[PDB]
Design an enzyme around this catalytic site. Structure first.
Site: not given
Length: 468
Positions: A374, A78, A308, A124, A431-432, A424, A169, A20
């Site tokens: 996160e 982290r 989240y 991760h 972001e993937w 986070w 993760n 990331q």
């Protein structure tokens, strides 16, 4: 809110992951990960057809960023190690990439020089592509020995300075998106060129847990007496509450929690899968040996919770993970969102739900030592600072962090063993499947202005928070 209201040993940090953040993906001997391949070869699955070739170039600029961290008063940072940066083919037999080792040594020495404690996630999601090609990565038991030797190298080279580890993760998201929805690397699903959304998730999850248990046991037996550090596991903990008080919806909420959260937490606390997974799946769910079950039981010093949002769960009115829970999730009840919607469809602002999570984990798992590894939210990427002058005025982010920490402090007053909180994320990032479309950072990254970092208002709120 004030930092002095939290225990002195409580860790306040911000988080990052290798793919990331780092960039320098194809230089300095780094091997391809499954995410290089996934982004390059499936750009139709990345919302902005972007990749992590460059990201924010943390690989070169980490010194400047850590200075900004120290200025904000960050206690912990982290970050995750790229397996394929240190072992290009994923195997010790493939050679150790000295420039990869050098980078993590430099990063770690820089954090500790600035008074910041590293929290290192061993894995991760950036699996070496060589391992996916060799035996289908986490689909094979061969992953465990390759994961063990990787964990061993990481402990030997960094563990003298690194005193806080996560093995994995969010293995739940990694398995769900990778092998149920094929929306993440390696892009397998029951549209996907290969996979089975009913069988492969439960095999992959199995091998993840065996990797976790092997890394944990190695740290306990070979490294913990000498290095005096701690090691846990981070999982994704979207919470579920019942749609209403109908007993069927109470059990649906229980079943969605078991299938998502319990899937990995039950083996690490009790040494078995949640019984509702065993009842539903029979043979599709692999069985732990008595030895494995012993290695897994309390295979943690802490559990990282990635919280989240919360959804409502209702009882469900070609087998796949998706339908295995017999539960439906939604953020809406009688056309009223559980909390304010944000740019991310799955992220409603429901700070109450983090206490609900912490109460559930306390009561279900006998109050294990947990950290929020996160917590944060994203604004839509609307371009450069000049194109988006209001990007810095992140009052919603500021409200998100404030109310969530209010509820973590409630958790502490109720005797929940929570000892960490990691935002986070440090800076806007990759972001993937979403690419750079979501900005989760305390720092704005101008990707059109040589990746210039500008602290958002949230940065200054955290600065004030940590100072008082």
């Amino acid at each position: 809110l004030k930092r002095t209201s939290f225990p002195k040993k409580f860790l306040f940090g911000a988080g990052s992951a290798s793919y990331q953040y780092e960039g320098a993906a194809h230089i300095d001997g780094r091997g391809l990960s499954v995410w290089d391949v996934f982004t390059k070869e499936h750009p139709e699955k990345i919302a902005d057809q972007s990749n992590g070739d460059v990201a924010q170039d943390f690989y070169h600029r980490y010194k400047e960023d850590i200075k900004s961290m120290k200025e904000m008063g960050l206690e912990s940072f982290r970050f995750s190690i790229s397996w394929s940066r240190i072992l290009p083919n994923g195997k010790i037999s493939g050679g150790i990439n000295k420039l990869g080792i050098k980078f993590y040594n430099n990063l770690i020495d820089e954090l500790l020089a600035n008074g910041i404690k590293p929290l290192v996630t061993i894995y991760h999601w950036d699996l070496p592509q060589a391992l996916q090609d060799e035996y289908g990565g986490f689909l094979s038991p061969k992953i465990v020995d390759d994961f063990l030797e990787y964990a061993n190298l990481v402990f030997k080279e960094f563990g003298d300075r690194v005193k806080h580890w996560a093995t994995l993760n969010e293995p739940n998201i990694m398995t769900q998106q990778g092998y149920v929805f094929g929306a993440h690397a390696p892009g397998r699903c029951s549209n996907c060129p290969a996979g089975n959304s009913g069988t492969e998730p439960y095999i992959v999850g199995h091998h993840l847990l065996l990797c976790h248990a092997a890394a944990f046991q190695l740290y306990k037996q070979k490294y913990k007496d000498d290095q005096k550090g701690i090691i846990g596991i981070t999982t994704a903990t979207q919470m579920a509450i019942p749609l209403n008080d109908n007993v069927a919806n109470l059990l649906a909420a229980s079943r969605a929690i078991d299938f998502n959260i319990g899937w990995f937490l039950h083996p690490v606390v009790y040494g078995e899968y949640p019984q509702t997974m065993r009842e539903r799946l029979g043979s599709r769910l692999p069985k732990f040996t008595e030895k494995e079950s012993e290695m897994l039981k309390q295979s943690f010093d802490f559990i990282g919770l990635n919280y989240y949002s919360t959804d409502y769960a209702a009882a469900s009115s070609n087998v796949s993970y998706t339908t295995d829970s017999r539960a439906t999730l939604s953020a809406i009840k009688d056309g009223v969102p559980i909390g304010d919607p944000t740019f991310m469809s799955w992220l409603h602002i429901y700070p109450e739900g983090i206490l609900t999570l912490l109460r559930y984990v306390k009561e279900r798992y006998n109050n294990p030592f947990v950290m929020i590894t996160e917590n944060g939210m994203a604004d839509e990427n609307k371009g450069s600072l000049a194109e988006d002058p209001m990007a810095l005025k992140d009052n919603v982010r500021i409200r998100y962090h404030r109310e969530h920490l209010y509820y973590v402090l409630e958790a502490i007053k109720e005797g929940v063993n929570v000892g960490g909180y990691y935002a986070w994320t440090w800076m806007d990032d990759f972001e993937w499947g979403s690419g750079y479309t979501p900005r989760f950072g305390l720092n704005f990254v101008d990707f059109d202005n040589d990746l210039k970092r500008t602290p958002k208002d949230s940065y200054f709120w955290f600065k004030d928070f940590l100072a008082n």
